[PDB]
Symmetry: C3
């Protein structure tokens, strides 16, 4: 909600409380999943061709006892917008791959999980320097592009050390990526994104998915008109898709597709399919499905501040030694949520 | 404070800073106790018979150094209010037992401690689904009731596992409870509450207080008029009252009583007595006092945003092997507080 | 930003996002340093001669992954201001030494580091009771003083225990200090501060800097007019200046000096020099430099809500066994920051 707007400076303080429960045979997923987010988006007019901005978003789990706290920063960045010349921001932000893969990340609860956070340039991550340009310098309506750099986020100590070190599955070396999207008209959009990240020496000491670079190549399509939403994304990755908590897939092929309809009375059913196919895994595993499910659900929007939903992950992965070793869930989940937001 | 009210959506952002110091021979209590809370309460009008809401409240200790952070979520829930048909909410909230025991939880600093947080359905806890009805459907003025369910919050791994696992003393199985309060008129109120929670297998592997279910039965009475506040609550529990950090009392009898007066110039003296009597404790302990103190104090309210208080916990427990083993404090405490709130 | 002002109560909710990167051969400093702060400052008019207030400020690092959270309370206090009779506040706050040493803590990124946080009464710390008077009771314009007490913040357990125990380098015993500053006119200011804190037995079990009390003596001078800022502070300490993470200096002499100029178009160059000279260190180290650098940098202010800066720490310490043992950084750092604030 915009809570301040005075003398060229505006501040939106926003958030949500999601009273959320999962039902699953997977005891690591089953039970209370209540959480909240809080954030702000601020903007300051500097002059005719320059606006400054800042955004922060934080998640605090609501499903723990008072003896602990599970919270984290989703984004935290500052930037400048310069008219038709583009914008630049730096901080914790979304990787440019998500400029296209976000088109399928629209499910009531699940979805968006052929990749994760702190996962090279695929989604949220630290130290992104991001240049963006909408409508190609004001010359081509509907043609947008981005160019992005990510500095190394290494280990806590030793050869890969940076100030902000972390575990191998959340590290990266220096990376570069970009995206292009185009409005084809009549509700249709097409997009592509590429990223290439150096990997660190400690990442390459894990058994799975060695290589000098983590690479991703994405294409996407969407239709968004007449109360219909359709989208698909295909992403091919190299040493970039996590294999549970074991390392990465030498290669993976990720595909997500979704269809939704918004009824005027407030109901938005959703059907989707997601898969991630890993190739050439070490330890004799070879080709393995890393993710495979159908998702059926619906959100009922009471208004823009209140909603409720059901989401059903129909998990098509087989329970096998591989999935158990990797810690990949093979069970179905039903989610029920009630959401207040501002 | 209400900081937003527009187009049927309202947001109250509230908080407090309590500059607080304890004086005690108990070194685990003595010293700086400064803390803050922050929260919001949002409400959205959906239609003539339906309002959505969300509430979140967080505590951050202000008495640590910058190398650590001690914070936690008090509540986090979302709900719907259906005019006279009642309300429903889900998330981290107060157990319905507290609908009655809260009547004595009014001391300047101490009190409210014959039970704790994450303590079956007695106070704050995860995964409450709560139905409430005020003035009995608009048929009986002053008659309120609630019915509540709490899903299992289990262990981090193994047989009792849920996604949001925690230590035994803060676990629960599936539970159900209810409360009824009635305005007798002329300032008097009467209330009762009952709860019954399944206990988990890991809870039942501790030495103290094994059983299938944790159950509570509460009666309360109060007078709240003419600047006088008098209240008492009596609660009988089974396998539900913590014995320090060792487990639970097979049975306990808890009693709290308080008298206060509000002077028009701002001063509110308070006198109270609390005890918790544990029965049939294991390891030869038998009947033991778990809590026993007189409390004398006063709050001076400068206005609705600023107050200061003294509170004196006169601890009547004897220092003995049992209390030392259980980690129950037997020393007096004096608290001095200065509170800004909004 | 002031977001509420009604019926005698006002609330300023403020914060910043600093998109920040360090370049250094010191891998513990190098890399992404993005962070945010959030805070509030509230004030309530009680009557003609009394105002209540509260302030809280929190830092949340923006340079970690989502599997961790690094955050802390900077300040959290409540107070009363009694017209010209002065103010009193209690909580986590700044020690009165900083009333003078803050005059040099004005660099774009670095600076302010001949002392740290939770470092006796030198900067931020727990449990400060602080009396302040501006303009000497309304009788002497520009003459300010303060008197401050800090209660013991001891160990987690054992002989020095307090409720809010911490590691030795962040402990203190009971302390007293004061400051006096005077506006000489025409941009000139002069100040002095003195503090004396009991040390704890666990502090005195460390090798470096044992003694009954930690003591500090500070003088400062500044010139602040005609777009020029000049300041210097000299502090002599006894058992109060940290030697890396090893303990304290039996004696230290700290000197900071800074010169800045503000151009109308928004650029503020800055040049500074800082040194901390430790004396009589144990383990044969004798006299050692603890800190020594020249700082050159500049901030460009777009407006009151947006800025960017470069800061260059030219480290003059030698890499030698002492600095490596103490964990004192001897490398240069360049910082680049982009800051949105409200
Ligand atoms: C109105 C015609 C504009 C076409 C722009 C196409 C841009 C393609 O760039 C990437 C290939
Ligand atoms: C194995 C290759 C599959 C083809 C993916 C290309 C998808 C491009 O979508 C439009 C951009
Ligand atoms: O606070 C005290 O009474 C004392 C207890 C001792 O064990 C020790 O902590 C001592 C401090 O070292 C004095 O600062 O204080
Ligand atoms: Ca490979």
């Amino acid at each position: 909600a915009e809570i301040y707007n005075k003398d060229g400076n505006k501040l939106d303080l926003y958030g949500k409380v999601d009273g959320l429960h999962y039902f699953s045979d997977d005891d690591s997923q089953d039970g209370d999943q209540t959480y909240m987010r809080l954030g702000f988006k601020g903007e300051t007019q500097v002059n005719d061709q320059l606006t400054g901005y800042g955004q922060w978003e934080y998640q605090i789990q609501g499903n723990s006892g008072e003896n602990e706290n599970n919270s984290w920063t989703r984004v935290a960045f500052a930037g400048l917008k310069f008219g038709d010349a583009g914008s630049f921001d730096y901080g914790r932000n979304y990787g440019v791959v998500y400029d296209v893969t976000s088109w399928t990340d629209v499910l009531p609860e699940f979805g968006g999980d052929t990749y994760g956070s702190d996962n090279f340039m695929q989604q949220r991550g630290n130290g992104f320097a991001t240049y963006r340009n909408s409508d190609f310098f004001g010359l081509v309506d509907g043609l947008n592009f981005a160019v992005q750099y990510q500095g190394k986020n290494g280990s806590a100590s030793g050869e890969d050390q940076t100030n902000n070190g972390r575990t191998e599955l959340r590290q990266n070396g220096d990376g570069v990526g970009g995206s292009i999207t185009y409005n084809l008209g009549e509700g249709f959009g097409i997009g592509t994104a590429v990223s290439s990240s150096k990997r660190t020496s400690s990442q390459n000491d894990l058994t799975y998915g060695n290589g000098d670079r983590a690479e991703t190549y994405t294409g996407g399509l969407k239709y968004d008109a007449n109360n219909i939403y359709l989208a698909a994304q295909y992403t091919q990755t190299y040493n970039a898709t996590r294999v549970g908590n074991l390392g990465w897939a030498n290669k993976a092929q990720n595909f997500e597709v979704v269809a939704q309809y918004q009824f005027d009375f407030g109901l938005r059913p959703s059907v989707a399919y997601l898969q991630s196919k890993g190739k050439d895994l070490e330890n004799g595993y070879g080709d393995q499905d890393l993710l495979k499910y159908v998702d059926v659900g619906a959100t009922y929007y009471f208004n823009k501040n209140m909603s409720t939903y059901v989401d059903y992950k129909i998990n098509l992965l087989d329970d096998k030694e591989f999935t158990r070793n990797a810690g990949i869930s093979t069970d179905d989940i039903v989610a029920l949520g009630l959401v207040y937001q501002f």
